[PDB]
């Protein structure tokens, strides 16, 4: 098919932007730790997640 | 002095988020599609009938001209 690959990898890039904003890394974030999470969400992250979803 | 300030949802929450599958049905019955196909076929048949009869008459005219010229 090969067309939906691009169509949905655009959305995958947006979710990678979410990953990078929350941890500074696009894929291997290492955000979830055995005590919780490393850092709190930036002040404008929830609004952008709502806009994407 | 300053109060707690961190990433929180706005008061009243967020707006609704659509998630249900939405594949609309555009709309034309199978009977209608078959009827349209048959109608265009019949119209083409009639047009070609008229044109082919005219072509037969034109060919007869050309043959008559040739026959007149032959001797």
Is any Cβ of chain B less than 8 angstroms from the Cβ of A42?
yes
Is any Cβ of chain A less than 8 angstroms from the Cβ of B8?
yes
Residues A45, B7: Cα–Cα separation, whole Å: 7
H helical segments located in chain B:
30-69
Task: Tell me whether residues B6 and A41 touch, CB distance under 8 A.
Answer: yes
Written as six digits, the tokens of B25 are 């049905």
Residues B45, B33: Cα–Cα separation, whole Å: 18
As a whole number of Å, the end-to-end CA separation of chain B is: 122
Chain B residues in contact with A50 (beta carbon < 8 A):
14-15, 17
Label the pairing between strands A36-37 and A32-33: antiparallel
Report resolution (Å) to 1 decimal. 2.7
Solved with? cryo-EM
Q: Which helix (H) or strand (E) holds A12?
A: helix A3-23
Residue with tokens 């655009």: A10
């Amino acid at each position: 098919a090969m067309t939906p690959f691009f169509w949905m990898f655009e959305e995958r890039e947006k979710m990678f932007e979410f990953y990078e904003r929350v941890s500074g890394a696009r894929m291997h974030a290492a955000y979830i730790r055995p005590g919780g999470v490393h850092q709190d969400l930036p002040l404008g992250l929830l609004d952008d997640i709502y806009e994407f979803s | 002095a300053s109060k707690v300030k961190q990433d929180m949802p706005p008061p009243g929450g967020y707006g609704p988020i659509d998630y249900k599958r939405n594949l609309p049905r555009r709309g034309l019955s199978g009977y209608s599609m078959f009827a349209v196909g048959i109608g265009t076929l019949l119209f083409g048949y009639w047009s070609m009938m008229k044109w082919n009869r005219e072509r037969r008459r034109l060919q007869i005219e050309d043959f008559e001209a040739r026959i007149a010229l032959m001797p």
